[PDB]
Amino acid sequence: DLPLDPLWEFPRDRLVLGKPLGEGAFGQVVRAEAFGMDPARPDQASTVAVKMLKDNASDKDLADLVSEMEVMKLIGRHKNIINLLGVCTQEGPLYVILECAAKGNLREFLRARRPPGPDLSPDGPRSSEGPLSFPVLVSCAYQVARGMQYLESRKCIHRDLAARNVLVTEDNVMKIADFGLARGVHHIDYYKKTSNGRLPVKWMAPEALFDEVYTHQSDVWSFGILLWEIFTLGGSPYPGIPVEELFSLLREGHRMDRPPHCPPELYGLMRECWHAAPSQRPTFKQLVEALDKVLLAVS
Numbered sequence: 444d445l446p447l448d449p450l451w452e453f454p455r456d457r458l459v460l461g462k463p464l465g466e467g468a469f470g471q472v473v474r475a476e477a478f479g480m481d482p483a484r485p486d487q488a489s490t491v492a493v494k495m496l497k498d499n500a501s502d503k504d505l506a507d508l509v510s511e512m513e514v515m516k517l518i519g520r521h522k523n524i525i526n527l528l529g530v531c532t533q534e535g536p537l538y539v540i541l542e543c544a545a546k547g548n549l550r551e552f553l554r555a556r557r558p559p560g561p562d563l564s565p566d567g568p569r570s571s572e573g574p575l576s577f578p579v580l581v582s583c584a585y586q587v588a589r590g591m592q593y594l595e596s597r598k599c600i601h602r603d604l605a606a607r608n609v610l611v612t613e614d615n616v617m618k619i620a621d622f623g624l625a626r627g628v629h630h631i632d633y634y635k636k637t638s639n640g641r642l643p644v645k646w647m648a649p650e651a652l653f654d655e656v657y658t659h660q661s662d663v664w665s666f667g668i669l670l671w672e673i674f675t676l677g678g679s680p681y682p683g684i685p686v687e688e689l690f691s692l693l694r695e696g697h698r699m700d701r702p703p704h705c706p707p708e709l710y711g712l713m714r715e716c717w718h719a720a721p722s723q724r725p726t727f728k729q730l731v732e733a734l735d736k737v738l739l740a741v742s
């Protein structure tokens with residue numbers, strides 16, 4: 444096999460694999476029960492997410508998974524990222540064991556929590572009150588900014604930051620996922636639509652799309668798209684615009700409109716994140732500060 448790294452190796456027989464969660468370009472993720480993830484409580488159960496190779500896996504798929512494992516080892520721990528818990532490399536298939544986020548991704552979290560429509564009959568004293576409030580939406584944005592600030596401090600560029608790549612825990616903690624990934628940036632099919640209808644090109648900064656240049660400031664552009672997703676309660680960006688039209692609109696400097704029920708403070712931050720010049724966009728540290736000021740004011 445690969446060499447044994449005792450810092451991270453976890454006995455595979457302490458895992459009970461459960462129902463799949465999803466599949467990526469290289470790898471599939473399944474939920475699992477782990478026993479004794481904390482060695483001081485060797486019989487204690489926890490729920491984890493296990494990434495492994497697909498059945499049709501190539502050598503490149505394996506190298507990609509090994510690279511992701513090594514990034515996750517070096518990233519260190521932060522509240523607002525999916526953290527590595529362990530690996531299984533010996534005497535069996537390669538597993539990368541990560542935190543599981545029980546509420547799924549932020550896009551599905553928001554879409555399932557949109558406020559009741561005008562067609563519902565009032566029933567009780569809170570018929571108009573949906574699950575989502577403005578301070579909680581701001582906190583979601585602030586937590587993503589804090590996770591990105593951490594990743595940036597560890598020299599990690601995400602390259603596809605989007606609400607679907609932010610996961611939500613049982614306690615509504617945002618955790619950035621899939622930050623350590625080979626994404627085939629020199630062979631992106633810009634017209635590709637996912638099985639859920641997503642066009643990932645809509646999150647790419649112009650220097651990434653047109654020039655294949657990625658920096659932390661290209662992640663800031665994507666964060667602005669993510670902010671728009673938050674304040675549309677999981678809307679899809681550039682509504683109605685196919686990829687061919689997107690290319691021409693971006694060349695003309697088009698930006699998304701201010702969404703309904705979005706204060707100008709938040710649309711202002713979106714527009715700063717989409718400034719054409721990467722040096723004219725805020726840094727993640729500045730976004731953390733700006734969002735914290737709003738969060739404190741409204742809390």
Ligand SMILES: *C(=O)c1nc(NC(=O)Nc2cc(O[C@H](C)c3c(Cl)cncc3Cl)c(C#N)cn2)c(OCCN2CCOCC2)cc1CN1CCN(C)CC1=O
Binds near residue numbers: 545
């Ligand atoms: C464990 O806490 C857990 N997790 C989920 N959902 C989930 O997405 N967990 C998750 C996924 C994940 O990466 C995958 C590939 C992914 C997916 Cl599936 C979607 N978008 C992006 C990504 Cl990147 C990682 C990593 N790294 C970590 N965690 C879960 O589900 C619930 C189903 N439901 C959720 C809301 O949206 C629709 C689906 C359930 C659980 C553990 N739980 C909790 C509740 N019990 C009752 C059942 C259960 O299994």
